[PDB]
């Protein structure tokens, strides 16, 4: 212990407590909790009890059926019998028995029997969640050492995090949106010259907007997807009014556009700084202290050291070398940057260099980058956004309710809070743990640190869609380190099978926003978004049998609009694709042949 | 108070006979009335549920007996 708040207070200390911050701590804690509760329920319990009813209760429950433990905390479920609920006195005596039992081996169970449930700092009463507002402070931030705070883009990220935390906690939506915009404006300017972030960047970051272009105020909800999907959603929602507003004041061009028509959207967007904000929001918000100059052969012996550490077994290195060989034979640069085990040392070096203090020149470079991005003029959007705008949708009929309107599922959401109440009643809460459902989508369960499973699966799916020989997938899986037989079998499986929308969506960089993950989105993605128009086939929304992965992208394109608008979630039908399904697929493929 | 505020909000959001009918009685944007019509359709669909039509939270004077 060598602290800084007290001078001359350095010393050493011998302790017997199990270490915290080790790899094995939480897992063994949970395992021991479960084992001790099980042995109590089986052997120790009946050996130290007298009443018949408590014995009947104790013989009825086991940890495999009703007991859930995670680390320090835990929760036990007592189910109701035919005659109502179990008597309280038996439970009290059993809790006294548990308290007596726990002290034998040095444990002090903190047991509360209040009729409610607590688990992972979640509070429930009578089947209704209760968010603890005070546990998430608005102005608080923990700091242990006396290090200085990060620069202004970091506080921008922190304000965005505050807004998202307010979203999850269920505040008054109109007032919370207004206050979030107030903070947004307050923290948007910093001197060095001055630097400013145009509102549109903050909208791209996920903050909903109230009233623009003369539309109706309070028209967009905050279930807006963050990112590109989000821009498309609100732009496609308000496009026929955007064009009218643009034309009404000095924005007319003889050329006709398939999206905006005869309105000079280029000049208007450049003047409104919408392109500037959209592009500036994508720039990194931390100094690029990575890539700083390093003397040569020193970085080389460093990288060699990490390479030797990573691969001590020769057979894995042989697998990687093979994978590279058939990758050069078959990959032929179809995908620009295929992940491999040899690039792990480089990523580790970049990450280790990243955790360091940045010199003044790095901050100067960052401010110069922001200024250059602000001053520049952009002709058009990104390829993905332009491709998205080619799709038109239609909203006919609202969904039938999925939850009774008189059932309180969570605090803060009620008729006084119209938008979240209607959204949850129309869609419904997610009754399945998100972790397992997201886990079942991945092809590979886990990978070596320094690589992303999402990146590997995205590369695999890009190599499927852009036509490539199976051997390319086998080489890629070998480069990841998989064995040759298993790599061949998995590539053969991947070649022909179809996969749910989430994985296919990842092919174009789309993921479910963290805001939706509190609702039952899967049923909406499956059933309540129909690609066939309400009046049959139009001969224009004809997806070819090749490039059949377009359906997932269309599903999110529709769902973003279905979820962005306020009020009841509405069934949405595909209407028209301008260039045609094959042309839009060609656009997606020519974007995939990038990065 | 919050009780009457909740009751008023619920009544406003929710609240909007046997007799023969008589003659006497493309580029879609997003609009307040357009949202209101979906809200009305949704609430009518909820109200026309057979279980909801008879469900009650408190018993009357004779069901308790």
């Amino acid at each position: 212990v060598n602290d800084s708040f007290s001078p001359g207070n350095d010393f050493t200390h011998m302790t017997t407590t199990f270490p915290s911050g080790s790899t094995a701590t939480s897992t063994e804690h949970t395992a021991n909790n479960s084992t001790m509760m099980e042995t109590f329920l089986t052997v120790w319990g009946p050996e130290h009890t007298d009443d018949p009813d408590v014995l009947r209760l104790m013989k009825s429950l086991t940890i495999q059926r009703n007991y859930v433990c995670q680390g320090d905390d835990g929760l036990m479920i007592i189910d109701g019998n035919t005659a109502g609920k179990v008597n309280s006195e038996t439970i009290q005596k059993m809790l006294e028995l548990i308290s007596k039992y726990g002290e034998e081996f040095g444990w002090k169970y903190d047991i509360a029997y209040d009729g409610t449930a607590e688990y992972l700092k979640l509070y429930f009463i009578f089947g209704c969640r209760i968010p603890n507002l005070s546990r998430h402070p608005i102005v608080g931030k923990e700091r242990a050492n006396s290090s200085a705070e990060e620069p202004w883009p970091a506080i921008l990220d922190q304000i965005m995090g505050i807004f998202f935390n307010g979203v999850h906690d269920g505040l008054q939506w109109q007032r919370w949106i207004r206050y979030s915009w107030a903070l947004c404006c307050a923290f948007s300017r910093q001197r060095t010259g001055y630097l400013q972030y145009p509102m549109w960047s903050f909208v791209y970051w996920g903050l909903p907007l109230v009233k623009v272009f003369g539309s109706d105020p309070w028209i967009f909800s905050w279930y807006m997807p963050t990112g590109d999907l989000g821009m498309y959603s609100w732009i496609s929602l308000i496009r026929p009014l955007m064009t009218r507003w643009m034309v009404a004041n000095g924005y007319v061009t003889d050329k006709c556009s398939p999206v905006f028509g005869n309105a000079d959207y280029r000049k208007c967007f450049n003047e409104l700084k919408l392109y500037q904000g959209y592009y500036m929001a994508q720039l990194p918000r931390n100094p690029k202290k990575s890539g700083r100059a390093a003397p040569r052969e020193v970085r080389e012996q460093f990288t060699q050291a990490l390479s030797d550490y990573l691969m001590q077994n020769p057979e894995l290195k042989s697998r990687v070398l093979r994978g590279r060989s058939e990758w050069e034979k078959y990959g032929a640069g179809i995908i620009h940057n295929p992940p491999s085990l040899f690039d792990v040392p480089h990523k580790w070096y970049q990450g280790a260099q990243e955790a360091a203090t940045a010199t003044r020149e790095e901050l100067a470079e960052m401010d110069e980058t922001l200024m250059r991005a602000r001053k520049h003029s952009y002709s058009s959007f990104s390829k993905l956004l332009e491709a998205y705008l080619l799709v038109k949708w239609r909203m006919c009929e609202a969904r039938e309710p999925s939850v009774d309107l008189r059932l309180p599922l969570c605090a803060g959401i009620d008729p006084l809070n119209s938008d979240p109440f209607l959204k949850m009643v129309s869609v419904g809460p997610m009754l399945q743990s998100t972790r397992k459902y997201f886990a079942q989508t991945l092809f590979m369960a886990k990978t070596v640190s320094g690589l992303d499973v999402n990146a590997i699966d995205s590369a695999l799916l890009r190599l499927r869609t852009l036509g490539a020989d199976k051997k390319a997938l086998t080489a890629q899986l070998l480069m990841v380190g998989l064995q040759e037989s298993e790599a061949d079998a998995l590539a053969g499986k991947i070649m022909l099978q179809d996969v749910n929308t989430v994985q296919l969506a990842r092919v174009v960089n789309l993921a479910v926003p963290d805001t939706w993950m509190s609702l039952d989105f899967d049923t909406m993605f499956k059933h309540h978004v129909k690609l066939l128009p309400k009046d049959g086939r139009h001969l224009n929304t004809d997806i070819p049998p090749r490039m059949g992965w377009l359906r997932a992208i269309l599903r999110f394109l529709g769902a973003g609009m279905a979820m962005t608008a306020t009020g009841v979630a509405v069934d949405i039908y595909l209407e028209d694709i301008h260039g045609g399904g094959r042309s839009l697929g060609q656009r997606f493929m020519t974007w995939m042949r990038q990065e | 108070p919050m009780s009457t505020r909740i009751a008023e909000a619920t009544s406003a959001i929710v609240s909007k006979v046997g007799l023969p009918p008589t003659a006497s009685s493309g580029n879609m944007t997003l609009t307040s009335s357009e949202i209101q019509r979906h809200i009305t359709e949704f609430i009518s669909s909820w109200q026309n549920h057979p279980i909801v039509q008879v469900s009650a939270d408190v018993e009357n004077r004779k069901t308790a007996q």
Partner: peptide, 18 residues
């Protein structure tokens, strides 16, 4: 004003929209 449906273009004269 009068607005075309397939492509959002507002034409002032009522007749040239056809």
């Amino acid at each position: 004003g009068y607005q075309c449906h397939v492509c959002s273009a507002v034409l002032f004269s009522p007749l040239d929209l056809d």
